[PDB]
Design a protein around this ligand. Structure first.
Ligand SMILES: *[C@@H]1O[C@H](CO)[C@@H](O[C@@H]2O[C@H](CO)[C@@H](O)[C@H](O)[C@H]2NC(C)=O)[C@H](O)[C@H]1NC(C)=O
Ligand SMILES: CC(C)CCC[C@@H](C)[C@H]1CC[C@H]2[C@@H]3CC=C4C[C@@H](O)CC[C@]4(C)[C@H]3CC[C@]12C
Ligand SMILES: *[C@@H]1O[C@H](CO)[C@@H](O)[C@H](O)[C@H]1NC(C)=O
Ligand SMILES: [K+]
Ligand SMILES: [Mg+2]
Ligand SMILES: [Tl+]
Ligand SMILES: [Tl+]
Lengths: 268, 992, 39
């Protein structure tokens, strides 16, 4: 033929069949032992998610949400993702004492449901009403963005203490139980309005620590609705929403490390 | 074009002096007119040689920039700029990826260009050396007056004059001469002075006395002649053009390189476009379809391989430089290993090029002297009183002297003023009797008759050094038979005795044997003149026989020859044991050529020519079956009337071939004949008459000390110490580097698979990219470099000089067996070890292997800063990318770890590491430096930006260890099978 | 610890780099030693 005879062509096939078969069987074996060394409830390493990311619902083309108020299908793209998220926070999804629980309607302290063990059933998560998100189809004019803190197993988000000076200096400082979120731009051509649990501009600490998908399915993380009823129009406004805390940090590279990058433009 | 120049020349030495003048419109006495000479100048053109048109270095460099790998790397470099252009227009990408990767790849092409350019070097100044043989000026007779003119202004027809010490300015017809002798070594390779006279003495113009040639010099006397040829039209000017004009051609090693380039280029374009369409079918945007292709290019092309080859060659050439063997062309480092036929000059190559005493006949006994340079033999006789009598004649009846200031150099190497035979005798006595000058001071010469054409003897009368005599001793030497007709007694073991027919017959026997050995034989005799008949003041007349020259006492015979170099016989046998055919090709006479052939082992004992059979059986040569003769001796005059097909039959039908009295073109023809049969041929030589053959040879080797400038220009290799044993070393080195290149190539190729497979699974699996493009270049250009080079220092696995020369048609540098092992077996195991570490990193950070399938869509989505892992955690864009790049880093390090084992297995093709050992210090160096480089690239701060290399946790380093070990075991088991059964299965499938 | 389990999300990449570079250097020196056993 090309290389060899039929007899040789066969033998080279019988070899590579057994050979690659063995190699596949060995590869699988090493994957088995790897998995055997891992927990079902907690990942081996968590230093790469460490400082929590802050992500929002409006799917930004490039950290930007520009549209026209005087146009219907101009914002119907951002309403798709906005709906996708809030559709999960339905009351019909949170039914019965299992696996949900009614928690303080005001920001409270942490809740420990034991260890990362299966020695108990599904760890009961705090309910969250999308109805706590006042004012927010969504904002056809002047968007109503929804913030979110990235989930990390066993992470206890710790707010800053009012020992020294603060950006939003001491205003509504629920020091003990709220992780604040203050959006900014100089360039003050807007109108910041925050909505959340208990009416505070933060995340209620009663939703922590997260016990993971395996130990807490259907779990709901707290949301923080933000509305920009800015009196300006037809210009790119670089708005940055920042979260503050002891366990919260940022990076010049990762522009989502505990903060937002939104470029709103109501070009109408 | 040069087929005309490969033919024997035609001449006009047969014409009379007068007749020759009519042909050139010339005067025998007055010479040309100033006006007629200038007319002929403009007519024929200058008496000069024009160098052939060369290829500029520009085109030579750029021709390498387009050879398979460079072509693919160019397509990659441009395709980078393509994707970059498409980006800069569509979505403003502030990145530098495609732009920088395009710059990097273009640089890789340029630098790789320098390496191949350095390897494909051609240092040739043939025509320049020939031009150096034309004198600046010549002496001509114009308008009846002699004047010096620019030699280029010399034309056919003018009257030229030459004298001892000057170069022949052009081909001349001798019309007048006085004691003129010439050095025709340019045409023959033999430096013994040849007389020139107006008389025609041979039909063959290269042998007649009435022609003098350009490229030669007058050694003594004076001559006048008419110019018959000028410039390019001279006999050796044509040889110049032939030699300088010959197409170089591709080396065996070069052909091998291009061959695997085709193979690897083939699989590259195959998988390249095979997966380019496979991606579009899967619905991949052309934006991405090209990005994957660039990666495929980088994965398939072994970026550092061609440069490795060059470095391995260079390092092998450095070792040979350290044995006095200079390599002018890097590729010639290997040709000697692939050589199946050596065509060797005799004089100054196989031989020392110096008349040396070989045997002596005295006391009715043949004695042998030591002919070797360094005198590696033993003594023959010292005791016999006869010896001292013969020794005295050899010293006394000798007019040769050592040049001043030689006392530092060895006797046999020092320059001597005199003819070759007298120098030989001088050096013979000086060696075994001490200072000859002393013997010539103790015995003052009073009268002598120098060797005469008519007398055929030379005699001398000396004052006997003996005090009790202080009388007159007569000594003489000459033609053995002439000396015999002048002897009455023979000095036997001390005492004289009558010359009976018995001893006279033993003389003839001794004389015939020595002459049969191709040796020049001389007779020696002396006579103690009677005291009473010769007073202490008796005057001797040299002009008229004033003393007896008959009834003298015969002392002995001495024989001499230009002997082989000490190492030559043994080197010839070694070449022949390695299955290399050795042919002699010489301008010298057949009797001498044949005798040295037997001396060095070109013709082995018992082997006969058709002429030998005929003489032994006493029958006509036509009655001899030529197939009964494995040896042959072909004279150039017969070679001339043979067609190439008939030359091919001679080459095919004889194992032991001697081509004697060959011209320079004839040497070229013999070389081409050998090549025509498909053989790789080496030429060894030292003369300008070797230049065409040396050029045409696959590898030409010139002698460094004895070699002429031309020969060393025409060669690929120079033996700087004239050590012929270096050929044996060269062939051995050549074979070793050929095997080691295979090892180094397999090693380099093996790591291509773990660079290809990640890109494929990226498409077919939709998982995060396991390894990056930059990461690949860190391997092929970084870590693999020193290890790959180090394989060039591997010792032989067996006695390589015991095997036959490779068949260049069947035995390739890269074959299917190499690809099967490197791509199909070992590289495949490396790929898995890479993937394993990849799955380990991701799974330990929260992304278990199961959830990875079909996630790249969301993984690469820059706007999703919340991807969910297996444990329900959310990752931003840059966070997961850090883990991904950490995966690139550990996959990279996994390659390094699996290359550890590969380096050790590529060490040997057959033998076990437990047999070959770990005595390669460069290899071990490679292991340490490779690992140091990898660690540095991972842990050095800032490398995460420039190369996207991230720090690895200690446990990460050990992921591929079980795969590294399986490689070592697998290959060790496999080679154990090879050795345990030379049959073929494992052998014919995987044996590189 | 409980709410004070910050060490769980921390890794000393600084020490690892220091050690990694020490090792790389020493492997580089060791290599020179073995190579220079004859040049
Ligand atoms: C989650 O809540 C949303 C609230 O808008 C539900 O949307 C409803 O969709 C139905 C049918 O398309 C409409 O008739 C209603 O007007 C919507 N709102 C309400 C309050 O009922 C959505 O269907 C819910 N999703 C799930 C899975 O239950
Ligand atoms: C990533 C995976 C799926 C690709 C696997 C590719 C396999 C099938 C390839 C890789 C190397 C290949 C072999 C390389 C060498 C030879 C020897 C030659 O004389 C005949 C073909 C043969 C035997 C090839 C057959 C196919 C082969 C085994
Ligand atoms: C939000 O909606 C409420 C009614 O639910 C209305 O009273 C109020 O004006 C709205 N706020 C703004 C800022 O438009
Ligand atoms: K050559
Ligand atoms: Mg010679
Ligand atoms: Tl490569
Ligand atoms: Tl490679």
């Amino acid at each position: 033929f090309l290389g060899r005879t039929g007899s040789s062509w066969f033998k080279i096939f019988l070899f590579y069949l057994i050979f690659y078969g063995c190699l596949a069987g060995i590869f699988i074996g090493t994957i088995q032992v790897l998995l055997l060394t891992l927990s079902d409830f907690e990942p081996k390493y968590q230093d790469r998610v460490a400082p929590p990311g802050l992500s929002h619902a409006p799917y930004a083309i490039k950290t930007e949400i520009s549209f026209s108020i005087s146009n219907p299908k101009s914002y119907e793209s951002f309403v798709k993702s906005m709906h996708k998220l809030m559709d999960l926070y339905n009351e019909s999804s949170q039914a019965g004492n299992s696996p949900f629980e009614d928690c303080s309607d005001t920001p409270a302290d942490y809740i420990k449901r034991g260890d990362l063990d299966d020695s108990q059933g599904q760890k009961k998560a705090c309910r969250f009403s999308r109805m706590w998100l006042k004012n927010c189809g969504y904002a056809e004019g002047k968007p109503c963005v929804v913030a979110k803190l990235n989930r990390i197993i066993g992470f206890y988000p710790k707010p800053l203490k009012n020992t020294t000076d603060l950006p939003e200096e001491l205003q509504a400082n629920y020091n003990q139980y709220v992780l604040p979120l203050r959006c900014a731009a100089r360039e003050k051509i807007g109108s910041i309005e925050y909505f959340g649990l208990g009416g505070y501009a933060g995340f209620p600490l009663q939703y922590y620590p997260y016990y993971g998908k395996r130990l807490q399915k259907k779990y709901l993380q707290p949301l923080l609705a933000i509305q920009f009823t800015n009196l300006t129009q037809n210009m790119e406004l670089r708005i940055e929403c920042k979260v503050y805390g002891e366990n919260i940090d940022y990076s010049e590279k990762d522009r989502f490390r505990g903060r937002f990058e939104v470029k709103i433009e109501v070009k109408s | 074009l040069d087929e005309l120049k490969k033919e024997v020349s035609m001449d006009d030495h047969k014409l009379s002096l007068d007749e020759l003048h009519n042909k050139y419109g010339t005067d025998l006495t007055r010479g040309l007119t100033n006006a007629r000479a200038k007319e002929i100048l403009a007519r024929d053109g200058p008496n000069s040689l024009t160098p052939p048109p060369t290829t500029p270095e520009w085109i030579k460099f750029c021709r390498q920039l387009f050879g398979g790998f460079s072509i693919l790397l160019w397509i990659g470099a441009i395709l980078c700029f393509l994707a970059y252009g498409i980006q800069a227009a569509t979505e403003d990408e502030p990145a530098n990826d495609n732009l920088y990767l395009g710059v990097v790849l273009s640089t890789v092409v340029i630098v790789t260009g320098c390496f191949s350019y350095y390897q494909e070097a051609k240092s040739s100044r043939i025509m320049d050396s020939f031009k150096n043989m034309v004198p600046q000026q010549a002496l001509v007779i114009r308008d009846g007056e002699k004047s010096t003119i620019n030699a280029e202004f010399v034309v056919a027809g003018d009257l030229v004059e030459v004298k001892g010490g000057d170069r022949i300015p052009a081909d001349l017809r001798i019309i007048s001469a006085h004691g003129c002798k010439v050095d025709n070594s340019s045409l023959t390779g033999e430096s013994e002075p040849q007389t020139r006279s107006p008389e025609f003495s041979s039909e063959n113009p290269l042998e007649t006395r009435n022609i003098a040639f350009f490229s030669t010099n007058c050694v003594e006397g004076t001559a006048r002649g008419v110019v018959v040829y000028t410039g390019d039209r001279t006999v050796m000017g044509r040889i110049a053009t032939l030699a300088s004009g010959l197409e170089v051609g591709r080396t065996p090693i070069a052909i091998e390189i291009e061959h695997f380039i085709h193979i690897i280029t083939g699989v590259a374009v195959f998988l390249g476009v095979s997966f380019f369409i496979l991606s579009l079918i899967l619905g991949y945007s052309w934006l991405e379809a090209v990005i994957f292709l660039i990666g495929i290019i980088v994965a398939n092309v072994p970026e550092g391989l061609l440069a490795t080859v060059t470095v391995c060659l260079t390092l092998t050439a450095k070792r040979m430089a350290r044995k006095n063997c200079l390599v002018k062309n890097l590729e010639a480092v290997e040709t000697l290993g692939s050589t199946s036929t050596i065509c060797s000059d005799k004089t100054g190559t196989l031989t020392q090029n110096r008349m040396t005493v070989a045997h002596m006949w005295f006391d009715n006994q043949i004695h042998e002297a030591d002919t070797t340079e360094n005198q590696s033999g033993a003594a023959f006789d010292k005791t016999s009183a006869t010896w001292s009598a013969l020794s005295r004649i050899a010293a006394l009846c000798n007019r040769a002297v050592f040049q001043a200031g030689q006392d530092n150099v060895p006797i046999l190497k020092r320059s001597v003023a005199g003819d070759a035979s007298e120098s030989a005798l001088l050096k013979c006595i000086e060696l075994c009797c001490g200072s000859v000058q002393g013997m010539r001071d103790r015995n003052p010469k009073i009268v002598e008759i120098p060797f005469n054409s008519t007398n055929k003897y030379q005699l001398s009368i000396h004052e006997n050094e003996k005090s009790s005599e202080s009388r007159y001793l007569l000594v003489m030497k000459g033609a053995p038979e002439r000396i015999l007709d002048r002897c009455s007694t023979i000095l036997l073991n001390g005492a004289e005795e009558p010359l009976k027919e018995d001893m006279k017959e033993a003389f003839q026997n001794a004389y015939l044997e020595l002459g049969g050995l191709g040796e020049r034989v001389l007779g020696f005799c002396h006579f103690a003149l009677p005291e009473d008949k010769y007073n202490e003041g008796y005057p001797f007349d040299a002009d008229e026989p004033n003393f007896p020259t008959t009834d003298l006492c015969f002392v002995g015979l001495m024989a001499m020859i230009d002997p082989p170099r000490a190492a030559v016989p043994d080197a010839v046998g070694k070449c022949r044991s390695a299955g290399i055919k050795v042919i002699m090709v010489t301008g010298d006479h057949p009797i001498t050529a044949k005798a040295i052939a037997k001396g060095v082992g070109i013709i082995s004992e018992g082997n006969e020519t058709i002429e030998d059979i005929a003489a032994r059986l006493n029958i006509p040569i036509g009655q001899v079956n030529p197939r009964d003769a494995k040896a042959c001796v072909v004279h150039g005059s017969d070679l001339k009337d043979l067609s190439t097909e008939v030359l091919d039959d001679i080459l095919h039908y004889h194992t032991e071939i001697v081509f004697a009295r060959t011209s320079p073109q004839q040497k070229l023809i013999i070389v081409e004949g050998c090549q025509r049969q498909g053989a790789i041929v080496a030429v060894t030589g030292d003369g300008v008459n070797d230049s065409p053959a040396l050029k045409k040879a696959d590898i030409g080797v010139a002698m460094g000390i004895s070699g002429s400038d031309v020969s060393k220009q025409a060669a690929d290799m120079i033996l700087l110490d004239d050590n012929f044993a270096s050929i044996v070393t060269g062939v051995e080195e050549g074979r070793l580097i050929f095997d080691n290149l295979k090892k180094s190539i397999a090693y380099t190729l093996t790591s291509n698979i773990p660079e290809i497979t990640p890109f494929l699974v990226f498409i077919i699996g939709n998982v995060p990219l396991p390894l990056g493009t930059v990461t690949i270049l860190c391997i092929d250009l970084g870590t693999d470099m020193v290890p790959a080079i180090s394989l060039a220092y591997e010792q032989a696995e067996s006695d390589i000089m015991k095997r036959q020369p490779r068949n260049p048609k069947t035995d390739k540098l890269v074959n299917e067996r190499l690809i099967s092992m490197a791509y199909g077996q070992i590289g495949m195991i490396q790929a898995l070890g890479g993937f394993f570490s990849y799955f380990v990193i991701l799974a330990e950070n929260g992304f278990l292997p199961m959830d990875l399938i079909g996630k790249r869509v969301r993984w690469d989505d820059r706007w999703i800063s919340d991807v969910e892992d297996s444990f329900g955690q959310q990752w931003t864009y840059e966070q997961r990318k850090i883990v991904e790049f950490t995966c690139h880093t550990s996959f990279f390090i996994s390659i390094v770890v699996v290359q550890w084992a590969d380096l050790i297995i590529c060490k040997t093709r057959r033998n076990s590491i437990f047999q070959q050992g770990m005595k390669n210090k460069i290899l071990i160096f490679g292991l340490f430096e490779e690992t140091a480089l990898a660690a540095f690239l991972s842990y050095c701060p800032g490398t995460d930006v420039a190369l996207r290399m991230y720090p690895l946790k200690p446990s990460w380093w050990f992921c591929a260890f079980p795969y590294s070990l399986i490689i070592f075991l697998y290959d060790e088991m496999r080679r154990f099978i090879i050795r345990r059964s030379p049959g073929g299965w494992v052998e014919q499938e995987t044996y590189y | 610890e409980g709410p004070d389990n910050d060490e769980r999300f921390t890794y000393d990449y600084y020490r690892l780099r220091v050690v990694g570079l020490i090792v790389a250097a020493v492997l580089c020196v060791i290599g020179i030693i073995i190579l220079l056993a004859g040049k």
